[PDB]
Design a protein around this ligand. Structure first.
Ligand code: CYC
Ligand code: CYC
Ligand code: CYC
Ligand code: CYC
Ligand code: CYC
Ligand code: CYC
Lengths: 161, 160, 160, 161, 160, 161
């Protein structure tokens, strides 16, 4: 994976260049966002269970999904599903700290879409849940952090389609 | 960066970052300004650092620039200096990132196999880095020189 | 079923079933009639079993149906009873199959993660099964009640 | 895998239903066939070597298959082939006991057709052998059990094409 | 061949062949002429070797050619001799290659499962090879008979 | 893998034939080339580092390949590349000793082309290097051995396209 710093490095390395004004300015941008990123990560860590609890209630419960014949039916599949949500939240949080989505491509999205098709996991429904988690998270961490977290929730969704 | 490294750790333990990891990152971005300034000086004076270090190097190791040496003649000497400039560049990368990882990934992994193949004397390359360290350090405060020292030293101790 | 389980064993040892496994299956299909009758009674009286057990449950645990409780109000109480009906249903599955496996695979694997998430008090759910066990047992012979007991008990002891 | 009982359960579970008249009747059907299934399995276990021996003699021997250049040529390939036959017989016997073919899909047929193509295993010839084994088995276990065993021999063949 | 075997060894150790391996191959190709001559004799007299050995075999083991025996009757006796010819053929393969590997890969791997299935008495097959060894050896020099002996013996000792 | 001897055997085995005149003559051909093969292998082993060193200088260095953005840029990729060359040289040498290329198909070329595409390894450039190594090797081992080594260098190249 990359974070915002090492990404800039590889961009300058690929060109065999020292860090110029633009590169230095991007690094500065990132450092200045540093503390807000940590603070938001602390908040999300602290409510991780409830964020997923709210996101599930809001988008999945009392539907066909959770009834006999739905993909969330049987306790094993219910657990699997909210386990996926913990994943998406935790890696979204990583990506947010890092200020770069490469960890999502690397450890979350790789062959995920194909897996979901294979088992019958409803992608559209999954995405509704993530988008719900985005709103719940935003409410919790504020507008600025919520926007940034949103970048990565969205990144995940796009990878699923 | 300690940011990547922390995340990788946390991920392997299926957890969010620890309060200490988080605090570590906080102190890391706090020192961002200082490390950027250090890289900026080395960037700005790169041509001098590499030229003077090259001159000192060829004093300590005239064999490499005398007949039979790996850097004999204008073109080979220029390629040598080219390589030195490479490592000064990588070092500025490491400085902003806070650790030696970009140096390792770009310039040390398999460096032995590369230079052996070419017949380039690796200890003389280590010496060249020492020489750049010497010149670079003088353009910095005692504080910044100390901090930058660890990057040069790592390259030297990994030149094997 | 002991039929699946035997086959799985035999397969993992690259062999046909053992005379004992075969005999085991023979005694299993022999008792098929009896277990079907037991499931049939529980099926037929499901509405009573779940209603009465629910009433007993809410006596033992008024907290869950009082404000602040997971089953507070008509809709949440109805969902609770809905869940109880789920487990009575799974238990009839287990009875015909001769073991608790369909109960496990449908209703116990990850049940902790599900109910924790929802904030449903898991010990109160265990209690609800006890209550259904109590009501169910009365509609059966001493023989059949004993046999059915092991299915209810397993659910209760696995509600963790 | 499923057996006849757990299959019925999943069908009723998928619908969120208790076991009704049809479901109960299928379970009864299965229990009533129980002893005949065990008896036939005992007989097949007892002659497993000779069933394959007869099936091979009847359909594969003294042909191009067993001569230099055939797929049964070399002792390693001869052994491989009759080893496949032991497999088909043993799992057919499992499926018969279980009164359900899901174990064939699960542990026998998965990627089998592709494997056989890959190594050059003659599928048509393989199927002749299995169909021969069916006749040999039928002779041995009687008409009713032989019919049932036949269900699964056939199931395997269809999976190979 | 020792050539394949050496290469396989060297490859598993990520290296070129050792001076000894190389020298081994050198002595192997040197003896190529001799081993070819031995195979050529066995090739040329194959019909005699198999016929006479078959006759000796059926003296030592009349059970296999009497009613109830695996080689009873003209056709089964002919198939038996057919098999013997198979193994004489494989042995000539082994001789030119310098080791028993082509014998193993073509005719011994799973030979037990094949012959068990057919109900062919495996010790009688071993005996048949002994008989071919006997006849073959007489058509060769003391030197060549000794060298060829190891191939026949290996088949006999692996007929299990 | 096969060597020249075991290849001939399998050809005669496939036909169920003893070794005839042609087969015997091929075996003889091989034995007569035996010592020249060992001698050339000894020479190549003895200069393996320099052969690759020369081949690299001749075809890859001071190009875009070794500059920032090239596939040989970063010391890890430089090492990887000349490591590939050691491989091609060592297996070419094996194939030469064996007088048969089956080891190249078996342990070198299997899924190689697909791998190279996957990582961005320039195939054309790789082949230039191998063809350079061929010329360097030829110079070193003489015309006859050089021709034979050439058979296998070429075999590798063809497998890459
Ligand atoms: C929940 C919102 C939705 C849902 C989820 C669901 N997923 C599965 C199965 C899997 N999910 C994953 C996904 C990941 N695994 C990982 O390790 C990571 C990153 C660390 C991700 C993103 C995988 C690999 C599987 C298969 C393996 C497994 O079981 O864990 C299921 C169960 C499928 C089954 O039938 O077994 C479910 C139910 N389903 C929904 O209905 C929601 C919309
Ligand atoms: C100078 C102090 C010493 C020295 C250097 C020297 N190097 C070469 C040739 C090359 N050096 C490289 C170096 C790198 N490639 C990388 O990707 C990285 C990491 C960023 C490094 C450091 C490469 C690729 C070459 C090959 C030439 C090319 O660019 O393609 C030479 C020339 C060798 C020759 O014979 O051509 C020299 C002289 N030599 C010394 O003796 C000094 C001790
Ligand atoms: C009743 C004794 C206790 C109780 C129950 C309760 N449950 C819920 C919500 C749900 N329960 C389930 C249950 C299952 N899903 C399955 O697949 C299986 C295995 C067959 C079971 C048992 C599910 C999926 C839900 C979510 C709602 C839905 O159907 O989508 C509630 C409501 C919780 C809420 O806040 O909505 C209640 C009240 N609660 C108690 O306190 C009793 C101890
Ligand atoms: C025999 C009637 C026919 C025949 C068979 C043949 N098969 C192979 C190779 C394989 N067969 C299998 C099949 C299975 N393996 C399993 O584990 C199971 C279920 C438990 C099945 C159904 C597989 C996986 C292989 C490849 C691996 C292996 O060698 O075991 C061969 C040998 C192929 C080779 O060249 O090595 C043969 C000869 N061939 C015939 O001619 C008959 C028609
Ligand atoms: C003779 C000394 C003994 C004997 C032999 C015997 N064999 C068979 C039948 C077969 N033998 C083979 C043998 C091989 N197949 C191979 O690929 C190899 C390696 C090259 C060998 C050695 C095969 C394939 C058969 C089946 C027939 C066929 O060719 O398809 C028989 C006939 C058995 C029968 O009942 O038909 C006999 C008699 N039997 C003895 O008793 C002697 C001790
Ligand atoms: C060098 C002439 C060219 C070049 C090579 C290059 N290759 C890789 C990566 C791999 N190369 C291989 C090839 C083999 N591996 C084997 O084990 C064998 C036989 C024993 C062969 C032929 C493989 C498998 C890889 C991937 C795994 C690995 O890294 O070793 C790289 C690095 C790719 C990367 O980005 O990591 C390079 C640079 N590249 C060139 O530019 C030359 C033309």
């Amino acid at each position: 994976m990359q974070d915002a710093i090492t990404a800039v490095i590889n961009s300058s390395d690929v060109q065999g260049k020292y860090l110029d004004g633009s590169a230095m300015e991007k690094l500065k941008a990132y450092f200045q966002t540093g503390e807000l990123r940590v603070r938001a990560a602390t908040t999300i860590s602290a409510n991780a269970a409830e964020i997923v609890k709210d996101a599930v209630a809001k988008s999945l419960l009392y539907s066909d999904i959770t009834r006999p014949g739905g993909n969330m039916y049987t306790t094993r599949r219910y657990a699997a599903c909210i386990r996926d949500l913990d994943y998406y939240l935790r890696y979204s949080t990583y990506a947010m700290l890092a200020g770069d989505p490469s960890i999502l491509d690397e450890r979350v999205l790789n062959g995920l879409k194909e897996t979901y098709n294979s088992l019958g996991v409803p992608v559209g429904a999954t995405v509704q849940a993530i988008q719900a988690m985005k709103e719940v998270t935003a409410t919790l961490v504020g507008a600025d952090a919520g926007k940034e977290m949103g970048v990565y929730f969205d990144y995940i969704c796009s990878g699923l389609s | 960066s300690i940011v990547t490294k922390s995340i990788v750790n946390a991920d392997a333990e299926a957890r969010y970052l620890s309060p200490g990891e988080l605090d570590r990152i906080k102190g890391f971005v706090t020192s961002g300004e200082r490390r950027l300034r250090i890289a900026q000086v080395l960037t700005e004076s790169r041509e001098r650092i590499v030229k003077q270090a090259g001159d000192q190097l060829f004093q300590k190791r005239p064999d490499v620039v005398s007949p039979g040496g790996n850097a004999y003649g204008e073109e080979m000497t220029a390629t040598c200096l080219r390589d030195m400039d490479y490592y000064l560049r990588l070092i500025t990368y490491g400085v902003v990132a806070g650790d030696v990882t970009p140096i390792e990934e770009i310039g040390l992994v398999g460096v032995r196999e590369m230079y052996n193949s070419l017949g380039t004397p690796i200890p003389a390359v280590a010496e060249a880095v020492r020489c750049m360290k010497s010149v670079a350090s003088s353009l910095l405060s005692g504080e910044d020189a100390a901090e930058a020292a660890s990057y040069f030293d790592y390259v030297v101790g990994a030149m094997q």
